[PDB]
DNA sequence: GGGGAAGGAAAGC
DNA sequence: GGCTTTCCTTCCCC
């Protein structure tokens, strides 16, 4: 397998720069304003100019402003970024019929039948970068390797606006030298459970007793890491299809008053249906984030499609279930639809 | 013993 | 902040 992974640079911020070139060279911060108060909300992402100083995805808009008070703060325009992403994805389809669109700004291409070696793979990578630059003036990073995990790691090592090949020789080196925390799928919590074990390199997962590993991080993640460490990881590139669509909104103030919560729940339903666009869900879940920030959900699956009227009435019953079973107040409220016909 | 369904955990975008 | 996917735990049932 020769996998070519594409990851768009500072995506949301870059799109804003393409639509407004005068932004080039200035720190730009794309924000998710929640509406609770002046600047409440978080940073979706920021371009290099702002990230260099610590303004990154996830931090409070308020903290970003403390760091860079004169940066350009822009509201997230997800619909615009999605449309631009879709066009780039269409360009990528032209280089291989085996394409896995992983997120709003990533895609894996199995170019095994397209190139003979990594030299050719690398050249195709340049061709792809130039094609996207020519057509949408968007820069991206290309990672190439023998499988999806290392192709992604290669891009991580090369961003931004880069391209890198991790050949077989280097894959073996990385299995030995790469911090296991930097392996896709290992977040802070798993990285912590692993440390508890002496494991901080993939290679270390081979000598530890499987059951010990499995009991700490779970069977799936254990087998995953071990397969990688043995250099036997094999996962085909496959067409992905959305499985769920939803919307969650933050309420002006916390509450567990049904009538006070309904307008938000209903608004969330309306927007979710907008997004479904022709897809008919058979399952609906009401999702609530409590005052202490926990997430609670109650759902229902129907033997048929869910009409918006049915979504409205069932959502109330589910929310009622949440209120009848959980004592905490609610901060955010929303819905999630799945099991499309 | 183990698959399926519901709800929570964890991860990355 | 807020969107989506995948795996885990618990319990029902064959
Ligand atoms: N917590 C996060 C992480 C990412 N994103 C958004 O998802 C897109 C890209 O994911 P990511 O690769 O993490 O952000 P980039 O800004 O593109 O960073 P880079 O240039 O380093 O690839 C971004 O444009 C933004 C988000 O809303 N919230
Ligand atoms: Ca990425
Ligand atoms: Ca990116
Ligand atoms: Ca990590």
CA atoms within 13 A on the CB side of A219: 0
State the Cα–Cα distance between residues A111 and A3, nearest whole angstrom.
6
Residues A6 and A115 in one domain: yes
Last residue of a domain, one of A58, A77, A96: A77
Last residue of a domain, one of A77, A111, A130: A77
**How many residues does this entry show for chain A?**
341
State the Cα–Cα distance between residues A65 and A340, nearest whole angstrom.
42
Instruction: List the A317 CA – B6 C1' distance (angstroms).
Output: 16
State the Cα–Cα distance between residues A270 and A335, nearest whole angstrom.
10
Q: A176-199 burial, b for 16+ CB within 10 Å, e for fewer?
A: eebebeebeebeeebbebbeeeeb
Closest CA to A144 of A7, A9, A3: A3
Question: Which stretch of DSSP H or E encloses residue A7?
Answer: strand A3-8
Residues A145 and A6 in one domain: yes
Closest CA to A30 of A59, A67, A66: A59
- The closest residue, in CA terms, to atom 3 on ligand 1 is A57
Asked if residue A119 is part of any domain, the answer here is yes
**Closest nucleotide to A338: CA versus each C1':** C4
Question: Which stretch of DSSP H or E encloses residue A124?
Answer: helix A118-136
Residues A160 and A173 in one domain: no
CB–CB of A213/A222 below 8 Å? Answer: yes
Q: How far apart, in Å, are the Cα atoms of A196 and each of A140, A229, A257?
A: 37, 19, 44
For the domain that residue A269 is a member of, what is the CATH number? 3.30.1490.100
Asked if residue A239 is part of any domain, the answer here is no
How many structural domains are present in chain A? 4
Q: A269-273 long-range contacts, Cβ below 8 Å, gap at least 24?
A: A269/A308, A269/A311, A269/A312, A269/A315, A269/A335, A270/A308, A271/A247, A272/A245, A272/A246, A272/A247, A272/A311, A272/A334, A272/A335, A272/A336, A272/A337, A273/A308, A273/A311
Question: Is A106 near strand B, with its CB below 7 A from some atom of it?
Answer: yes
Footprint of strand C on the protein (CB under 7 A): A 32, 34-35, 40-42, 44, 57-58, 60, 76, 218-221, 240-250, 275, 332, 334, 336, 338
CB–CB of A31/A75 below 8 Å? Answer: yes
Asked if residue A217 is part of any domain, the answer here is yes
CB–CB of A252/A286 below 8 Å? Answer: no
Asked if residue A99 is part of any domain, the answer here is yes
Residues A171 and A298 in one domain: no
> Which of the following is catalytic: A106, A134, A271, A327?
A106
For the domain that residue A229 is a member of, what is the CATH number? 1.10.150.20
Asked if residue A254 is part of any domain, the answer here is yes
Asked if residue A152 is part of any domain, the answer here is yes
Question: Looking at ligand 1, which atom is closest to the CA of residue A15?
Answer: 24
Instruction: List the A187 CA – B12 C1' distance (angstroms).
Output: 9
Tokens representing A73 are 């703060």
Closest CA to A140 of A120, A151, A126: A126
A44 CA distance to ligand 1 middle (Å): 7
Contacting residues for A300 by C-beta, under 8 A, at least 6 apart = A283, A284, A285, A314, A317, A318
Residues A138 and A6 in one domain: yes
A220 CA distance to ligand 3 middle (Å): 27
CB–CB of A28/A173 below 8 Å? Answer: no
Residues A110 and A137 in one domain: yes
**For the packed helices A118-136 and A78-93, what is the interaxial angle rounded to 10 degrees?**
140
**Torsion angle of alpha carbons A83, A84, A87, A93, nearest 10°?**
-110
CB–CB of A143/A166 below 8 Å? Answer: yes
Report the residue among A8, A11, A46 best suited for mutation to probe ligand 1: largest number of ligand atoms under 8 A from its CB.
A11
Question: Which stretch of DSSP H or E encloses residue A78?
Answer: helix A78-93
Residues A6 and A134 in one domain: yes
Residues A309 and A320 in one domain: yes
Helix (H, G, I), strand (E, B) or coil at A119: helix
Residues A253 and A292 in one domain: yes
Closest CA to A171 of A244, A241, A114, A228: A228
Helix (H, G, I), strand (E, B) or coil at A48: helix
What resolution in Å is listed for this PDB structure?
Answer: 1.9
Closest CA to A27 of A63, A56, A60: A56
For the domain that residue A131 is a member of, what is the CATH number? 3.30.70.270
Last residue of a domain, one of A34, A59, A77: A77
For the domain that residue A15 is a member of, what is the CATH number? 3.40.1170.60
CB–CB of A167/A113 below 8 Å? Answer: no
Residues A153 and A184 in one domain: no
What is residue A15's DSSP assignment?
H
* Phi, psi (rounded to 5 degrees) for A247: -150, 140
Instruction: List the A190 CA – B6 C1' distance (angstroms).
Output: 24
**Closest nucleotide to A287: CA versus each C1':** B7
State the Cα–Cα distance between residues A2 and A112, nearest whole angstrom.
5
- Domain interval for residue A110: 2-10+78-166
What is residue A201's DSSP assignment?
B
Give yes or no: A106 in active site. Answer: yes
**Closest nucleotide to A103: CA versus each C1':** B13
E-strand ranges in A112-190 read 140-145, 163-165
Residues A49 and A90 in one domain: no
Asked if residue A300 is part of any domain, the answer here is yes
Residues A6 and A149 in one domain: yes
**CA angle (A265 as vertex; A260, A269 as ends), nearest 5:** 155
Q: Which residues surround ligand 2, an ion (CB under 5 A)?
A: A 7
Closest CA to A11 of A62, A76, A100: A76
Asked if residue A238 is part of any domain, the answer here is no
* Ligand 1 pocket, CB under 6 A: A 7-12, 44-45, 57-58, 104-105, 159-160
């Amino acid at each position: 397998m020769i996998v070519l992974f594409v990851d768009f640079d500072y995506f949301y911020a870059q799109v804003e720069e393409v639509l407004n070139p005068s932004l080039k060279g200035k720190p730009v911060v794309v924000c998710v304003f929640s509406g609770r108060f002046e600047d409440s909300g978080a940073v979706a992402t920021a371009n290099y100019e702002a990230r260099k100083f610590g303004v990154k995805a996830g931090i409070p808009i308020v903290e970003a402003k403390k760091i860079l008070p004169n940066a350009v703060y822009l509201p997230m325009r997800k619909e615009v970024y999605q449309q631009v992403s879709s066009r780039i994805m269409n360009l990528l389809r032209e280089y291989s019929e085996k394409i896995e669109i992983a997120s709003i700004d990533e895609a894996y291409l199995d170019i095994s039948d397209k190139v003979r070696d990594y030299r050719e793979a690398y050249n195709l990578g340049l061709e792809i970068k130039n094609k996207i630059l020519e057509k949408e003036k968007i820069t991206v990073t290309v990672g190439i390797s023998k499988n999806k995990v290392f192709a992604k790691i290669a891009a991580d090592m090369a961003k931004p606006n880069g391209i890198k090949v991790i050949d077989d020789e280097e894959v073996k080196r990385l299995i030995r030298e790469l911090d296991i925390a930097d392996v896709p799928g290992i977040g802070n919590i798993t990285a912590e459970k692993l440390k508890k074990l002496g494991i901080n390199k993939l290679v270390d997962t081979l000598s530890i007793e499987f059951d010990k590993l499995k009991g700490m991080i779970g069977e799936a993640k254990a087998k995953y890491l071990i397969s990688l460490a043995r250099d036997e990881y094999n996962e085909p590139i496959r067409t992905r299809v959305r499985k769920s669509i939803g919307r969650i909104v933050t309420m002006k103030r916390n509450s567990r008053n049904l009538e006070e919560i309904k307008p938000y729940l209903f608004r969330a339903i309306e927007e979710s249906y907008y997004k479904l666009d022709k897809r008919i869900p058979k399952a609906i879940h009401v999702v609530a984030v409590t005052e202490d920030l926990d997430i609670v959900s109650r759902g229902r699956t129907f033997p048929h499609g869910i009409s918006k009227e049915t979504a409205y009435s069932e959502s109330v019953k589910l929310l009622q279930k949440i209120l009848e079973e959980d004592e905490r107040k609610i901060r955010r409220i929303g819905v999630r639809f799945s099991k499309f016909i």
